[PDB]
Design an enzyme around this catalytic site. Sequence first.
Site, PDB file in Angstrom:
ATOM      1  CG  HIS A  18      65.596  85.926  27.838  1.00  0.00           C
ATOM      2  ND1 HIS A  18      65.202  85.971  26.535  1.00  0.00           N
ATOM      3  CD2 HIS A  18      65.830  87.193  28.231  1.00  0.00           C
ATOM      4  CE1 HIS A  18      65.220  87.251  26.134  1.00  0.00           C
ATOM      5  NE2 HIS A  18      65.581  88.005  27.150  1.00  0.00           N
ATOM      6  CG  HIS A  58      63.128  80.654  27.751  1.00  0.00           C
ATOM      7  ND1 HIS A  58      62.090  80.985  26.922  1.00  0.00           N
ATOM      8  CD2 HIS A  58      64.132  81.527  27.473  1.00  0.00           C
ATOM      9  CE1 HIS A  58      62.473  82.003  26.149  1.00  0.00           C
ATOM     10  NE2 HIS A  58      63.711  82.325  26.446  1.00  0.00           N
ATOM     11  CG  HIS A  67      61.178  85.451  29.083  1.00  0.00           C
ATOM     12  ND1 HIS A  67      61.442  86.798  28.982  1.00  0.00           N
ATOM     13  CD2 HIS A  67      61.623  84.890  27.934  1.00  0.00           C
ATOM     14  CE1 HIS A  67      61.893  87.066  27.766  1.00  0.00           C
ATOM     15  NE2 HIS A  67      62.060  85.903  27.102  1.00  0.00           N
ATOM     16  CG  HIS A  89      60.724  91.081  29.040  1.00  0.00           C
ATOM     17  ND1 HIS A  89      61.489  89.982  29.282  1.00  0.00           N
ATOM     18  CD2 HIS A  89      61.463  91.942  28.313  1.00  0.00           C
ATOM     19  CE1 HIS A  89      62.664  90.170  28.693  1.00  0.00           C
ATOM     20  NE2 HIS A  89      62.685  91.388  28.105  1.00  0.00           N
ATOM     21  CG  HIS A 115      59.622  87.838  32.800  1.00  0.00           C
ATOM     22  ND1 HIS A 115      59.768  87.941  31.387  1.00  0.00           N
ATOM     23  CD2 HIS A 115      58.329  88.091  33.125  1.00  0.00           C
ATOM     24  CE1 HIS A 115      58.516  88.180  30.932  1.00  0.00           C
ATOM     25  NE2 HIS A 115      57.639  88.314  31.965  1.00  0.00           N
ATOM     26  CG  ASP A 129      63.120  89.217  32.045  1.00  0.00           C
ATOM     27  OD1 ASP A 129      62.961  88.246  31.268  1.00  0.00           O
ATOM     28  OD2 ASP A 129      62.183  90.018  32.337  1.00  0.00           O
ATOM     29  CG  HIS A 150      66.243  84.991  22.568  1.00  0.00           C
ATOM     30  ND1 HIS A 150      65.028  84.490  22.034  1.00  0.00           N
ATOM     31  CD2 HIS A 150      66.262  84.683  23.888  1.00  0.00           C
ATOM     32  CE1 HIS A 150      64.355  83.943  23.022  1.00  0.00           C
ATOM     33  NE2 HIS A 150      65.079  84.047  24.154  1.00  0.00           N
ATOM     34  NE  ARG A 193      62.020  80.235  22.550  1.00  0.00           N
ATOM     35  CZ  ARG A 193      61.214  79.871  23.536  1.00  0.00           C
ATOM     36  NH1 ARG A 193      61.375  78.739  24.183  1.00  0.00           N
ATOM     37  NH2 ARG A 193      60.209  80.653  23.874  1.00  0.00           N
TER      38      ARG A 193
HETATM   39 CL   LIG Z   1      60.989  84.205  23.759  1.00  0.00          CL
HETATM   40 ZN   LIG Z   2      61.232  88.266  30.310  1.00  0.00          ZN
END
Ligand SMILES: [Cl-]
Ligand SMILES: [Zn+2]
Lengths: 153, 153
Positions: free
Chosen positions: B46, B48, B63, B71, B80, B83, B120, B143
């Site tokens: 992702h 962020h 995100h 999401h 997002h 994403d 992640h 993370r």
């Molecule tokens: Cl997250």
């Molecule tokens: Zn997302």
Amino acid sequence: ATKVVCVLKGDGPVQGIINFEQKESNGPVKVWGSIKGLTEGLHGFHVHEFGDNTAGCTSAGPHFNPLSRKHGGPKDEERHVGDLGNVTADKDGVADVSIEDSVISLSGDHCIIGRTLVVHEKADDLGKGGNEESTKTGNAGSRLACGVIGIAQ
Amino acid sequence: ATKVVCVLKGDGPVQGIINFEQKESNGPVKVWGSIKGLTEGLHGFHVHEFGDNTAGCTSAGPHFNPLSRKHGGPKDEERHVGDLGNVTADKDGVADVSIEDSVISLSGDHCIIGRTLVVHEKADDLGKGGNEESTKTGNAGSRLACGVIGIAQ
Ligand SMILES: [Cl-]
Ligand SMILES: [Zn+2]
Ligand SMILES: *[Se]c1ccccc1C(=O)NCc1cccc(Cl)c1
Ligand SMILES: *[Se]c1ccccc1C(=O)NCc1cccc(Cl)c1
Ligand SMILES: [Cl-]
Ligand SMILES: [Zn+2]
Ligand SMILES: [Zn+2]
């Protein structure tokens, strides 16, 4: 207001956190924070062109210079956008950074987001050193710590 | 063309280099590189919101979601901007990343420069996990590594 941040890290003891804040579009940028692990005295402090840390601080490239000028100090007309002069470390090796600059920006062609902030081994001579390297790098020597400049909350 | 790069690091031995390239302002972004030190399988991947790594990967925030959507997976209209789905690590703990995405950008209000890329612990369920957290984070857990996305040569 726009807020950006940079975490400085490198291969040795030098580490820091630097904050940037700009209240209005094209207004001055306040720069503040702390660096530790430095030798007492002046350390060149620059925004470099690339936010590329793939090989550590060397992949950051030369000073951020969108307007194709020569190297100078932050209070000179003839300067790179990235020329923030020097930070000063005390005998404890701590630099308490407090800068206001009107040339860097957090929007537009002068924007420093996604570039690299570097703290150097030696003093930046602000282009007044009387060799040719003075007008390009300011003779501030190796790159002790750096980070990519990022968008903050 | 615009080129941007990100070095992924964290609290454990996960490390990566991710490149992004965009031929035209209105074009897809090609994403390529390598991450090592992962458990075999799918890891959520992702962008962020904040390029803030002052307290490690948690200061990057949620995100990147400039359009206030839920999401999803990268192929979904409901996603997002940040994403990018999952990367896949092999038995050797290596993910060879190869993504093309038309929602992220390297210019405009969907620009990812100065934001944080995060890999992640767990698989992103792409919003199909059957709990409320699925539509927010995709249940991808902690993370493992991150970096600020910066301008490359
Ligand atoms: Cl997250
Ligand atoms: Zn997302
Ligand atoms: Se200012 C700058 C420099 C390089 C790349 C992108 C940008 C930028 O202006 N990004 C858009 C943006 C959106 C929201 C908040 C901020 Cl600080 C910047
Ligand atoms: Se990324 C982004 C988002 C919104 C407005 C402008 C930009 C942008 O890319 N601006 C800064 C810049 C200048 C030169 C080269 C690059 Cl990669 C980025
Ligand atoms: Cl230099
Ligand atoms: Zn420098
Ligand atoms: Zn300079």
